[PDB]
Amino acid sequence: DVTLYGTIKAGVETSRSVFHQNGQVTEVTTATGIVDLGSKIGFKGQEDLGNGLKAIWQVEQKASIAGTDSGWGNRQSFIGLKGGFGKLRVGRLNSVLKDTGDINPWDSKSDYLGVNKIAEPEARLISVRYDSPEFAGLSGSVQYALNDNAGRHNSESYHAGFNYKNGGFFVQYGGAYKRHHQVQEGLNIEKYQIHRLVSGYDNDALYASVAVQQQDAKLTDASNSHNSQTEVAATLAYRFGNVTPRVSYAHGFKGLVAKADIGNRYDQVVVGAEYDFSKRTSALVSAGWLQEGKGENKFVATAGGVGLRHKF
Amino acid sequence: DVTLYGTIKAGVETSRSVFHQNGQVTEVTTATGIVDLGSKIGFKGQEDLGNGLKAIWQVEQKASIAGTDSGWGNRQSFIGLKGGFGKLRVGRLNSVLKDTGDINPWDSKSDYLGVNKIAEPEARLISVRYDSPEFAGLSGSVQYALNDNAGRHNSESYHAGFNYKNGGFFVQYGGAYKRHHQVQEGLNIEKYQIHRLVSGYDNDALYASVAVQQQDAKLTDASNSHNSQTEVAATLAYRFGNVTPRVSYAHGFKGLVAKADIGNRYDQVVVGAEYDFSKRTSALVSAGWLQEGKGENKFVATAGGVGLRHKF
Amino acid sequence: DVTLYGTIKAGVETSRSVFHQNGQVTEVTTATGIVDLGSKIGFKGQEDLGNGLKAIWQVEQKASIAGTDSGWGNRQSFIGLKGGFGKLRVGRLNSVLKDTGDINPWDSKSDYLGVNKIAEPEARLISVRYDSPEFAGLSGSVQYALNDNAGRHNSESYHAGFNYKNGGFFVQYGGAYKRHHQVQEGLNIEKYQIHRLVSGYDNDALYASVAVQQQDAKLTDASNSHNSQTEVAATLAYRFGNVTPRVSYAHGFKGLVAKADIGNRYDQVVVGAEYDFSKRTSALVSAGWLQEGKGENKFVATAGGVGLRHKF
């Protein structure tokens, strides 16, 4: 069983970013560009080893149709075993966090055409992951990333999650703890933990999801100042034949973060539709609004885009 | 429909470059090396979407057998749609220019073993391209590359071309306009335009081609000095069973270019033969001469090479 | 004939390195990490050209499951022809040396979990290689790497080897000569030659091998000081059903090398077992000890590891 698979997706996006600083406009920048929406190519396989035991492997790469990427195995890549005991994998693996929701189902490159801000702590990392068998809707996962694989200024990290599925209803949890975390521009953070909870309903013609996410850590400053951030995101989609409109809203609460991201409070909505020419090929259109102000020092972004997506 | 394809081609080249500066020899350099002639590997597919409509995609990479290249999609890569209306593609795409002739059919790495100088403004770039259906020999193409995709010192660019084909006879035109163009070592240029016209006869046992190319631009110097260059290239090939000798001649007229390329006037001839072991596998041999002097400050290059090429 | 193939292999290794400097411990460092053991993906093909003649090609890349590698064709990649006359290849090719033994059959990333030190002069390089047909157990190889392909501070190099095989018994020889060789940190060397001889017995259930390796060169210092190094390695394996324990010992003699590698004298043993779930999938475990001291300034390393390997 050796399979070549991938997703090719690209389109065009335009956007406009406005800083109001109580004087109305202080800055206006625009952007209009053809962009890749995250095209990828992978190789994978499995082998039946008998007694229900299986070998599994995958080597998956970024393959932007812009021709900008390079690297083998820089997307999710692993080897492992799977059988009655569950599934054990090693390699460059999604964090449990990254697998908890499909919290950002938008194919977009602009940060205003998807629910990107809440998705940002998601990552792949070199680690070991155990995924349990499913028993009556319930499964779980534990994952560990060693201190040596993390680098000089990054500690080991612990990851856990559980999932429940019954019919179209689901709830997923995922969390992580990290002793030392490098922030590249600013002061680093310690005792970082993130927790995410998602619940919704998923099937044909009806998709709904709501997610809340909490991050906490201590700043490596003169006082070990606590930092925290809370974010919620909800999306709703409904399929009419070949067309599926969806809408997303996300909100970031005013949180104690040193970074100038920072996050300050934000609100965003993304709106759009997919048109399916087939089960593998879809056209995409979307539009988005984001405000990171208070009403006074507003940052207002608008954007729109169209795209094409093909799976194979 | 998911296809893996490619061209593997390599050989060995030797060359000798002589600067005469009215004293006869001022410099003599030589080069003898095993070289890759542009090996490549790609993935592509299409899907019938019904009503004669189709999804198309390709991800194509450099894959030198020297093992020097890296990158996904750094050759022609795209997604698009094709149907009765014609063909629309987006991604890293050949400029119309690059598709107008097969002006340099030589597989070579040395600049003296192919018609390389005239081919140099050819490129791939991130853009949108529309290719029309063919009606009684006639088709056309328009292509646009956005200012944001081009970089900070490069403007948007416009590309157009038309083709005519009837039996073995063809004529192809291709042009481009670019408001701002960065030249890396020298002063940048503005209002750059290039036009190329090619006509010839192509089939089994008889290939002939002649091409003329004109470039014009304004120099970003103290006076907006006009710059221009004109070049012609002709090649002739004839197949005797398994062997196909061909010869090329190219001439660059003495043109107003600031660059020390510059181009000054040049003449070159390339001579060679392909031997086909099969429809996919060919042996290659070639030899070349180039003079970039006036007769006084001559630069004289000679070269030879042998190679092997396999398509799959 | 177009084939996609590869080896995916990864596991976890722990090690501990101790410097004794007559005071007992001066330094103790440890390392525990998930690691890729040299995963790779390749494309290859051949075409029957008639009369027993064949075209052959391969493009093979590193593809670490850590996601750290990049490059096409950065493992063994070539094009060539094969027929009654033998086999002729061009491209990035194993040196004859690298093909003489399977002197280090350990999949390991730590230098203490394989016979790595003796294997270090092995390399791939851009070159031409001729491999003879086999006549009554005997074959040979000659290989040449041009001065231009080698770089500015590296000369051309000559490679030769012969092989004998009869039943499970083999003897292999491989050597190389290199006029100028750059050493990156230290003084460069000249008139470098390496010779390796390996003999052993190989089949089902019984593998034995012994190898001796000699290197000589002149140092580009004030006196053209001679430098030399001698190393021996032996390994023994026996298969019991699905399990195959093996052991290796290697010794480096006290040799005249300027480098602080340097090599000083060393002894090492590696011990381990492969468990085969199938002909393509194997679990691995190993442990290793190395001493680079004299008894006084000892460097003592221990290590252990477990891994999984799948071929396709």
Swiss-Prot record, chains A, B, C:
Intracellular or extracellular location(s): Cell outer membrane
UniProt record, GO biological process: monoatomic ion transmembrane transport
Main localization (coarse): membrane
GO cellular component: a single term: pore complex
Tree of life domain: Bacteria
Positions in coiled-coil regions: none
Keyword line: Cell outer membrane, Ion transport, Membrane, Porin, Signal, Transmembrane, Transmembrane beta strand, Transport
CDD domains assigned to the protein according to its UniProt record, in alphabetical order: gram_neg_porins
Entry's Gene Ontology molecular function annotations: porin activity
Membrane association type: Multi-pass membrane protein
Family recorded in the similarity comment: Belongs to the Gram-negative porin family.
Quaternary structure and partners: Homotrimer.
Function: Serves as a slightly cation selective porin.
Additional free-text comment from the UniProt record: Present in outer membrane vesicle formulations which are used as vaccines in human.
Protein name per the record: Major outer membrane protein P.IB
Protein source organism: Neisseria meningitidis serogroup B (strain ATCC BAA-335 / MC58)
Lineage per the UniProt record: Bacteria, Pseudomonadati, Pseudomonadota, Betaproteobacteria, Neisseriales
Gene: porB
